[PDB]
Design an enzyme around this catalytic site. Structure first.
Site, mmCIF file in Angstrom:
data_model
loop_
_atom_site.group_PDB
_atom_site.id
_atom_site.type_symbol
_atom_site.label_atom_id
_atom_site.label_comp_id
_atom_site.label_asym_id
_atom_site.label_seq_id
_atom_site.Cartn_x
_atom_site.Cartn_y
_atom_site.Cartn_z
ATOM 1 N N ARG A 74 0.849 -1.176 0.000
ATOM 2 C CA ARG A 74 0.000 0.000 0.000
ATOM 3 C C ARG A 74 0.885 1.227 0.000
ATOM 4 N NH1 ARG A 74 -2.965 3.206 4.387
ATOM 5 N NH2 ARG A 74 -4.039 4.570 2.885
ATOM 6 N N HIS A 94 -3.016 11.047 -0.228
ATOM 7 C CA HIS A 94 -2.466 10.894 1.121
ATOM 8 C C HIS A 94 -1.814 12.174 1.540
ATOM 9 C CE1 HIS A 94 -1.309 7.480 4.091
ATOM 10 N NE2 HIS A 94 -1.071 8.630 4.722
ATOM 11 N N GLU A 130 -7.748 8.917 5.296
ATOM 12 C CA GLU A 130 -8.018 9.676 6.529
ATOM 13 C C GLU A 130 -8.478 11.108 6.291
ATOM 14 O OE1 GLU A 130 -4.784 9.235 9.310
ATOM 15 O OE2 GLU A 130 -5.129 7.057 9.489
ATOM 16 N N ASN A 186 -8.013 2.178 9.158
ATOM 17 C CA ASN A 186 -6.736 2.444 9.850
ATOM 18 C C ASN A 186 -7.039 2.476 11.335
ATOM 19 O OD1 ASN A 186 -5.747 2.777 7.264
ATOM 20 N ND2 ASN A 186 -5.253 4.958 7.520
ATOM 21 N N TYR A 234 -5.469 2.307 15.283
ATOM 22 C CA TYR A 234 -4.361 2.455 16.243
ATOM 23 C C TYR A 234 -4.830 2.358 17.698
ATOM 24 C CZ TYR A 234 -1.612 3.793 12.182
ATOM 25 O OH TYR A 234 -0.909 3.820 11.037
ATOM 26 N N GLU A 271 -4.040 0.157 7.728
ATOM 27 C CA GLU A 271 -2.940 0.534 8.602
ATOM 28 C C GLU A 271 -3.227 -0.018 9.955
ATOM 29 O OE1 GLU A 271 -2.000 4.755 8.794
ATOM 30 O OE2 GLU A 271 -2.256 4.956 6.597
HETATM 31 C C1 LIG Z 1 0.958 6.751 11.982
HETATM 32 C C2 LIG Z 1 0.170 6.805 10.671
HETATM 33 O O1 LIG Z 1 -1.047 7.514 11.001
HETATM 34 C C3 LIG Z 1 -2.091 7.472 10.018
HETATM 35 O O2 LIG Z 1 -2.851 8.543 10.692
HETATM 36 C C4 LIG Z 1 -1.706 7.888 8.555
HETATM 37 O O3 LIG Z 1 -2.554 7.547 7.426
HETATM 38 C C5 LIG Z 1 -0.220 7.598 8.252
HETATM 39 O O4 LIG Z 1 0.199 8.584 7.266
HETATM 40 C C6 LIG Z 1 0.657 7.670 9.538
HETATM 41 O O5 LIG Z 1 0.473 8.952 10.088
#
Ligand SMILES: C[C@H]1O[C@@H](O)[C@H](O)[C@@H](O)[C@H]1O
Ligand code: NA
Length: 443
Positions: A77, A121, A166, A293, A295, A352
Site C-alpha cells: 500500500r 495521502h 483519513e 486504519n 491504532y 494501517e
Molecule cells: C501513523 C500513521 O497515522 C495514520 O494517521 C496515517 O494515514 C499515516 O500517514 C501515519 O500517520
C-alpha cells in the site's frame, strides 16, 4: 477460540505514503505540496525535519521492494503524489511523474506484490491551497480529474484503489486544529473541508469508473477510533457519542447513504457545512471496499470546559503504551464487529495498524522491538476473532514498511517494521518484521 489460519488468499502487506518516504521533492517536474510549505514553516514540525529527502524512496523504491520481498508480503500500500502527476493541481499532466509510477507498478507486479494505491495521502498541490484548498468545491472537481488521469494510465495493472486516506485528518488536523498542513485553525473551515473531501471522493469514484480500462475495486480509507464512555452517566455517554460522531460517524454515515449525523449537525450548529441532496448522492457513490486504519481507542469523560467535542481521554496506565499511544487490541475487534453488523461496506481491509517505539540498533546490529512484535501478534489474534464472527476481512497492512517522516512529529517518530537510517538511507528489518515474515509464511 478462533482457530489458527487466515484465508489462503488473504492480502498481507505494509503501507507508506508518498510525502513520508519519497524525497526528491523538486525532481522530475514535481510541484510544491501543502506539506512542503508546512514542513518548511518554522515550528510546525517538532524536530526541524522535512520530507525533502525522507527515505529517498523516489530513488530507492527498489530497496523498498527488496524489503517487501524479504518479508514475503503479497501487497504494498503506497500513495501517488498528486504534485508529481498534475504539478499545478489543475492543469496539464506531467508524464514523467506518471511514468515513474508506471515503472514502480511494473516492478511491484514483477515481484508478486499487488499495488494498493492511495490517490490522496495529504499532499495537496499548493496552487490549489492558494485558491482555498479543501475550502473550495473546485478542489473536489479537479481531484476527480487527477483520479481519472491516473486510472487511465495505471488501471490496466492496478485493480485496487483508494481515493482518500483519513479525511478526518486532512479536514480536522489540517484546517481546524492546525497541526497538519495547511495549518488553519477554524472549525467551520474544517467542516467545510470535510464536505469537499467527501465530495471529491465521490466525484473521483464516478470519474474512475468511466476512465477505468478494466473494472476496478475502489475504496476509501478511514481512521476509526472505537469510543467508550468512562461511566454510564448521561454526561459521559453523551461525550462518547460526540467524540464518536466527530471522528467516525461524520464520515461513515454519509458514505453509507445516511447523510451527516443529525446529533453532530445539532452540536456543530452554524459551523456545519453547506450540503444538499445532490452532494449526498455523489458522496455515496458505490464502493467495493472500505479500508480501516486502526491504532487506538478513546475512553471518554465529559469535559464541559474543552474545544469541540468536551470529551477528555481517560488513560489506563495498566495498559501498555508505546512511544506515543495506548495499546488496546480489542478495539480492532470492536470496530470491525460494528462495521460488519451496522454498516454496508464490504469487504474490509485493515489498511494501517502499527506502532512507534524508541527503536535503536543494538550492539548485535538488530532492532529488538518486541513490544511491536507483541502489538502485531495481539491485533492479528483479534482479526481471527473478527473473521470467526463473519466479518468480511480480506487483508492486513502494517503501518509502516519503514521508519519515515511522521508528519508533525518529523523523522523522530519511528513506525517502521524496518529501521531507516536517515543519514545513510540504509534500511534494516526489525525483529517484528522478521516475526511478520515468519507469521505470514506459517499461514
Ligand atoms: C501513523 C500513521 O497515522 C495514520 O494517521 C496515517 O494515514 C499515516 O500517514 C501515519 O500517520
Ligand atoms: Na511503554
Amino acid at each position: 477460540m478462533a482457530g489458527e489460519r487466515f484465508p489462503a488468499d488473504f492480502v498481507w502487506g505494509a503501507a507508506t505514503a508518498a510525502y513520508q518516504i519519497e524525497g526528491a521533492v523538486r525532481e522530475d517536474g514535481r510541484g510544491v505540496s501543502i506539506w512542503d510549505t508546512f514542513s518548511h514553516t518554522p515550528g510546525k514540525i517538532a524536530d526541524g525535519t522535512t520530507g525533502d529527502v525522507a527515505c529517498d524512496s523516489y530513488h530507492r523504491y527498489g530497496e523498498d521492494i527488496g524489503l517487501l520481498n524479504a518479508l514475503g508480503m503479497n501487497a504494498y500500500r503506497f500513495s501517488i503524489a498528486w504534485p508529481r502527476i498534475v504539478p499545478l493541481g489543475a492543469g496539464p499532466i506531467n508524464q514523467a511523474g506518471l511514468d515513474h509510477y508506471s515503472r514502480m507498478v511494473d516492478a511491484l507486479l514483477g515481484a508478486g506484490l499487488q499495488p494498493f494505491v492511495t490517490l490522496y495521502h495529504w499532499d495537496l498541490p499548493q496552487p490549489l491551497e492558494d485558491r482555498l484548498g479543501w475550502g473550495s468545491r473546485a478542489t473536489a472537481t479537479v481531484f476527480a480529474e487527477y483520479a481519472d488521469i491516473v486510472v487511465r494510465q495505471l488501471g490496466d495493472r492496478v485493480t485496487h484503489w483508494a481515493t482518500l486516506n483519513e479525511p478526518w485528518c486532512s479536514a480536522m488536523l489540517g484546517y481546524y486544529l492546525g497541526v497538519h498542513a495547511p495549518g488553519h485553525t477554524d472549525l467551520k473551515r474544517g467542516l467545510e473541508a470535510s464536505h469537499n473531501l467527501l465530495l471529491g471522493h465521490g466525484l473521483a469514484v464516478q470519474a474512475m469508473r468511466a476512465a477505468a480500462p478494466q473494472p476496478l475495486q475502489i475504496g476509501i480509507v478511514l481512521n476509526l477510533t472505537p469510543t467508550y464512555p468512562a461511566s454510564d452517566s448521561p454526561e459521559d455517554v453523551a461525550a462518547a457519542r460526540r467524540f464518536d460522531g466527530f471522528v467516525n460517524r461524520w464520515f461513515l454515515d454519509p458514505l453509507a447513504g445516511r447523510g451527516y449525523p443529525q446529533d453532530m449537525l445539532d452540536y456543530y450548529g452554524a459551523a456545519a457545512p453547506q450540503a444538499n441532496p445532490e452532494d449526498l448522492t455523489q458522496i455515496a457513490a458505490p464502493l467495493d471496499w472500505l479500508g480501516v486504519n486502526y491504532y487506538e481507542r478513546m475512553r471518554a469523560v465529559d469535559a464541559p470546559d474543552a474545544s469541540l467535542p468536551q470529551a477528555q481521554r481517560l488513560d489506563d496506565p495498566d495498559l501498555p503504551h508505546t512511544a506515543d499511544r495506548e495499546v488496546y487490541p480489542e478495539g480492532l475487534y470492536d470496530i470491525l464487529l460494528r462495521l460488519h453488523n451496522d454498516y454496508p461496506f464490504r469487504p474490509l481491509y485493515i489498511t494501517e495498524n502499527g506502532c512507534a517505539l524508541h527503536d535503536e540498533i543494538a550492539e548485535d546490529g538488530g532492532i529488538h522491538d518486541g513490544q511491536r512484535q507483541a502489538f502485531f501478534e495481539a491485533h492479528l489474534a483479534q482479526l481471527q476473532r473478527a473473521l470467526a464472527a463473519g466479518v468480511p476481512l480480506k487483508g492486513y497492512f502494517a503501518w509502516s514498511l519503514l521508519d519515515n517522516f511522521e508528519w508533525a512529529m518529523g523523522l523522530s517518530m519511528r513506525y517502521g517494521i524496518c529501521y531507516t537510517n536517515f543519514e545513510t538511507l540504509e534500511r534494516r528489518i526489525k525483529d517484528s518484521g522478521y516475526w511478520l515474515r515468519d507469521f505470514i509464511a506459517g499461514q
